[PDB]
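Case study.
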Amino acid sequence: GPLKPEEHEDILNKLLDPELAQSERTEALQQLRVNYGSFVSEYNDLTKSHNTLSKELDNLRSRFGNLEGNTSERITIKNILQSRPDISAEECNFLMVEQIDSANLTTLQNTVKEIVLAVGIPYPKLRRKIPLLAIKLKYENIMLSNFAQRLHRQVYEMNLKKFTDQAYYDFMSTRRMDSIDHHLERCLDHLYD
Amino acid sequence: GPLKPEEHEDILNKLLDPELAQSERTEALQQLRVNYGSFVSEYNDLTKSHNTLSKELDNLRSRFGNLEGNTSERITIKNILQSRPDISAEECNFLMVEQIDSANLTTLQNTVKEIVLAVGIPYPKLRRKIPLLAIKLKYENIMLSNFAQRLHRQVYEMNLKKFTDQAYYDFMSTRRMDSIDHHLERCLDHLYD
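After joint prediction, the assembly is written out as follows.
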C-alpha cells in the first residue's frame, strides 16, 4: 500500500540532496508520483465503503424502527394499575405480564395467530372484543354452569371438568375443533327431564 | 484538505526543473511534506470512522435479529391448513391471519398483555391453554346456554345477548371486571323455580 510517513520522508530527504544524480531525482519523483496515485485511490475506495456502510446503517435503523413500532405507547404495569383499578401488582406479577416484553416478534405473531384461530374473531377486531371474552369466560360460563350445577345437585354435582379434559383429549388426538363430542351436551339432556 | 492529484503533480513538475532556486526546492518539498501528513491524518480518521460504523452495524444486526426471532418457525396459512384440517383458506382470510404479519412489536405486546389480563392465565402458559379457551367458548358456553334456553322456553327465550351487552356497558363505565352485576345471574334464579 501507500508509503509510511517515515518512507515518504526519506524520499523527500533524498531529493533535498544537492549532489543527487539527475536519473536519481526523476526516479524519486516517480516513486512520489506512483505512491500518491495509490494513496488517493485507497482513500476514495475507503470513502465509498464508508458511505455504503452509512446507507446500510440508515435502512437498518428505519427497518428496526418500524418493526419495533412506537415505544411510547407500550402498556406498562404502571399504566395497567392506573387504568384498571381492579388489578393489583400481585396479579400482574402472577400473570407474568412483564415477561411479554422479552418475547420476540415471531413468538408474539404465533401467539396472536393462535388466539384469533381459537376465538374466531378477526385480528383487526380482536383488542376491541377482548372485554367480551373476559365476560363470557369469567361470568356467563360460571353462572351458566352454576345453574346447571345447582339443578344437577337437587336431582342427585356434574363433573364439568372431566368433560373439559375429555374434549381437550379429543381435540389433541383429532386437531379438529369441529368434531369434538362434548359429553356435557349428553348429560345436560339427561338433566333436561 | 489534501492536494488534488493535479496540484500534487504540479509540485513534482516544479521539482524536476533544473534551474529551480534552492529555497524554491526546499519550499516545494515542504509543501509535499505538510500535505502528506494531512492526507495520512484524514485517512486514519476515515479508517476509525469506517470501523466505528462497522461496530454499530454489527450490533444493529444482532439487536434486530433477536427481536425478530427465528423467521423459520413463523406459522403460515400453509402450516395452519396442514396442521388444522378443520380450518379453510376462507376462514384464514376472514380472520385476517396474514395481517398479524404487518403488526409491530409494540402492538403485539399490547395485544398479548390484554389477552393475559382478560383470561387470567400466566403468559408462559398461554399458548398451551389456548385450546381450553376455544372449548369454553365454542362448546361449553353454547351447550350451557342452550340448556338454560330450552328450559326457559318451556317455562314461557332469554335475551342472553341483552345481558352481555349490559355487562360490557358496566365494564366500560367502571373499568372493573370485579363488580359487573351480570343480570344473567338474576334471571337464572328466577328460572331456578
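Observations recorded in class. Chain A touches chain B through 116 residues (CB under 8 Å). Chain A is about 75% helix and 0% strand. We will return to this complex in the next lecture.
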